[PDB]
Symmetry: C3
Subunit: 141 residues, 3 copies
């Protein structure tokens, strides 16, 4: 039916302690629909329910011991953000022209009013060049 859904895709990040990524939400393959609202680097949840949520962040060098992606839920009532999913990968070679994707997806019970965001260990390692490499989405099941 009309289930809230969104697919967001990476853009060049505007420089600003795991910083949140900000996203493309309507151009190319990105979109939000059915009351799903992308606002202020958050996906804002319109309807309480169980959602499948996912993200891939491709990292590329050009030093760090590891790279990490975390998908986080912020709730109006609760002060502290809740980590939903964490992908952390220690990084192997010196140099270098390495690259690598960290993908995560799972199902969570969310409340109307919740806000989701994706944080990374190092924004300058995020590959922003292409909407098919780094993305973030969620849909009511």
């Amino acid at each position: 039916g009309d289930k809230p859904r969104a697919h967001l895709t990476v853009v060049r990040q505007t420089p600003t302690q795991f910083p949140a990524l900000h996203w493309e939400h309507e151009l190319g393959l990105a979109f939000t629909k059915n009351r799903m609202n992308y606002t202020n680097k958050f996906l804002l949840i319109p309807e309480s329910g169980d959602y499948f949520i996912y993200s891939q962040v491709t990292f590329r060098g050009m030093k760090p011991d590891s790279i990490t992606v975390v998908i986080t839920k912020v709730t109006d009532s609760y002060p502290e953000p809740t980590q939903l999913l964490m992908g952390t990968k220690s990084v192997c070679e010196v140099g270098s022209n390495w690259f690598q994707p960290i993908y995560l997806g799972a199902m969570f019970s969310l409340q109307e009013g919740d806000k989701l965001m994706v944080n990374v260990s190092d924004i300058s390692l995020v590959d922003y060049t292409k909407e098919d490499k780094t993305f973030f989405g969620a849909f009511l099941l």
Copy 2:
């Protein structure tokens, strides 16, 4: 509607030839609902249908040539367990303080009575510290 669904999260494993993991099923972000039953290290399927099933296992050193996760289906009638999904990754450096996630998810037609579990090549390499790093879930589509 009321579709069977469960998200399970890692706990410290109680020591016991690809051993099955056992899981948190109700505390923090974990849950089972709509007839989904977590029992005896299995997710037991209440209703025949097509399910999306997924798991991430984060591994960390502190030797092994590789690390492997397998999601397996046990069926009452059939004797032999069926491997649904396998993620195997050869491991790179000596030492060491490496870590790394293996994520897998896909859709399968399951029968009422089926049991799913997650096995790993080495339980002592599984990072159990955090519910957002190692998890296992399934939902009727």
Copy 3:
């Protein structure tokens, strides 16, 4: 209800510039149903809607700087294929008996008539030995 769905699993590829993989569609764990049609290395979409689409390709050595999987949409009207998802991973050791999975999944709005395929940087590195290691699926949400 009757939502188009398919899970496809790897086979040995018949030798034929990111070549498309061809798949098992009915034996073992593979299947197509509800008007989903696997034909000519494409999954052909019967009904316009939002789909979750996913693939894992396990690569194994036995040289390449990196390995890449791309899931692509071909549309009747548009000439150029659209890359939906790309997983690219630089490969680490010399030799060698390395292996490694690249997993990708996300949601896309598709039109009736669309065709999806999976391309890889090097078909000869794809591990074809087992239906649980390399697979490709899609379901209408």
